[PDB]
Amino acid sequence: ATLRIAAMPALANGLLPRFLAQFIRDRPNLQVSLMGLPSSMVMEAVASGRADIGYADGPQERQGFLIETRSLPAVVAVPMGHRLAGLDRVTPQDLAGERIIKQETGTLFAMRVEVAIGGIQRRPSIEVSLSHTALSLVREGAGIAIIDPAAAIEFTDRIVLRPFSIFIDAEFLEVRSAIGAPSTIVDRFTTEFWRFHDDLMKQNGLME
Amino acid sequence: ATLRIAAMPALANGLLPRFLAQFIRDRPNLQVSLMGLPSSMVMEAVASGRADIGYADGPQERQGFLIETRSLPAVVAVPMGHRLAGLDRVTPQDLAGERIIKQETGTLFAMRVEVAIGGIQRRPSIEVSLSHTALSLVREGAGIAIIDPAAAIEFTDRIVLRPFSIFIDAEFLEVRSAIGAPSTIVDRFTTEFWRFHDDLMKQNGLME
Numbered sequence: 001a002t003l004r005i006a007a008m009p010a011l012a013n014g015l016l017p018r019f020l021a022q023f024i025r026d027r028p029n030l031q032v033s034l035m036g037l038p039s040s041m042v043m044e045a046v047a048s049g050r051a052d053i054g055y056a057d058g059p060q061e062r063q064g065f066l067i068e069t070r071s072l073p074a075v076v077a078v079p080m081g082h083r084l085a086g087l088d089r090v091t092p093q094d095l096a097g098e099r100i101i102k103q104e105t106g107t108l109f110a111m112r113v114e115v116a117i118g119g120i121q122r123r124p125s126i127e128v129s130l131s132h133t134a135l136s137l138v139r140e141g142a143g144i145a146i147i148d149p150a151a152a153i154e155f156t157d158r159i160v161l162r163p164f165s166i167f168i169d170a171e172f173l174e175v176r177s178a179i180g181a182p183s184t185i186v187d188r189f190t191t192e193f194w195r196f197h198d199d200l201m202k203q204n205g206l207m208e
Numbered sequence: 209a210t211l212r213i214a215a216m217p218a219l220a221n222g223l224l225p226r227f228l229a230q231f232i233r234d235r236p237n238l239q240v241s242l243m244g245l246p247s248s249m250v251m252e253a254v255a256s257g258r259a260d261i262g263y264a265d266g267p268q269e270r271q272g273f274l275i276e277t278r279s280l281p282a283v284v285a286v287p288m289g290h291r292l293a294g295l296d297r298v299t300p301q302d303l304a305g306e307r308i309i310k311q312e313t314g315t316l317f318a319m320r321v322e323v324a325i326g327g328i329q330r331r332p333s334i335e336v337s338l339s340h341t342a343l344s345l346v347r348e349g350a351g352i353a354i355i356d357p358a359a360a361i362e363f364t365d366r367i368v369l370r371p372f373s374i375f376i377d378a379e380f381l382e383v384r385s386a387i388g389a390p391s392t393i394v395d396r397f398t399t400e401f402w403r404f405h406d407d408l409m410k411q412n413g414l415m416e
């Protein structure tokens with residue numbers, strides 16, 4: 001038995017290996033691989049057959065793929081003790097004067113954020129590409145970030161997460177080859193991962 | 209003022225943003241970017257000028273680059289409470305029967321590990337490409353990992369690190385363009401990052 005998974009770091013760093021450790025605990029003869037790649041390379045892995053399952057940021061070219069989706073609101077991550085931690089939610093103008101940690105310029109997620117805060121004076125920001133970099137900077141008191149909740153979950157013991165007043169789609173995809181035969185093991189992983197993902201998001205106030 | 213950095217996730221996830229948050233705390237007008245990329249893409253970023261500084265796994269093609277180095281022994285990461293946590297050091301045969309979390313097949317680091325344990329019976333392993341995935345799996349009790357200490361440092365509160373009896377080179381590179389004019393800001397970052405990296409490694413028993 002062999003299972004090969006490819007995912008972006010947002011999930012490959014924290015959520016997916018937490019799940020994988022549950023999945024395999026009683027499958028001692030299941031050979032597994034879990035590759036952290038950029039989403040673009042996640043797709044190329046699934047298409048070339050180098051990976052059975054892919055997890056990638058949305059959106060992607062869906063041609064040769066079977067694609068399941070999750071959309072969740074992005075959350076605001078702020079350092080412990082920040083003025084904003086004492087709020088029910090965070091609006092664009094609450095961010096005025098703050099150093100904002102931004103995702104990478106030109107990505108769909110980054111532009112959604114940038115559009116939601118088009119009404120505030122732009123200060124010098126920090127640009128990153130990994131959600132985990134942003135969350136580490138938040139933890140260090142360097143600024144605040146609007147991020148996908150999947151990554152944020154690994155930091156809830158050391159930063160504060162608050163809902164944003166504006167819905168910013170933080171979508172990722174579970175990706176399969178459109179070409180292929182049924183796979184019991186793949187159907188099981190994907191299915192249980194959703195249950196596991198949905199449980200965590202709902203139990204932390206990040207999903208309906 | 210603008211600073212652009214590209215690094216592999218092993219450093220871009222944890223160490224580099226910890227440092228960046230110190231570097232910028234009193235530079236409110238310094239525009240910074242910190243991109244997590246695969247090492248191969250880290251080099252392409254530095255060569256094309258899309259990044260001023262690169263941090264990448266060793267080794268790389270050194271042609272158009274100025275390259276500074278750190279080599280440190282890889283450490284063994286084991287779950288809290290593991291039998292091996294009670295040892296001064298871990299040898300190859302101490303790993304017999306353990307589920308080993310391996311780096312990606314065919315990489316120089318992965319083959320160094322695999323060579324150091326050629327004398328043990330091979331059991332089904334878990335293959336990953338990010339050190340943070342491996343360390344998360346260790347934390348979950350899924351197995352043990354031989355990893356670069358740079359990444360391991362972000363987990364010392366939740367796993368146990370022990371020296372390996374065999375020296376496995378865990379090298380990374382600070383990378384600059386061979387083409388260019390002096391840069392005060394780049395010289396400062398790199399210099400202080402080394403001081404910061406060296407401090408942490410020495411203060412955690414991971415460097416001489």
Ligand SMILES: C[C@@H](N[C@@H](CCCNC(=N)N)C(=O)O)C(=O)O
Binds near residue numbers: 009010
């Ligand atoms: C860089 C990488 N994605 C980020 C997350 C990007 C923001 N999240 C999102 N769009 N859902 C990561 O894995 O940390 C990618 O290009 O795949």
Ligand SMILES: C[C@@H](N[C@@H](CCCNC(=N)N)C(=O)O)C(=O)O
Binds near residue numbers: 218
């Ligand atoms: C996948 C990525 N490097 C790993 C670390 C690989 C093992 N460490 C090492 N060889 N020093 C990471 O960033 O987690 C790279 O290809 O750049």
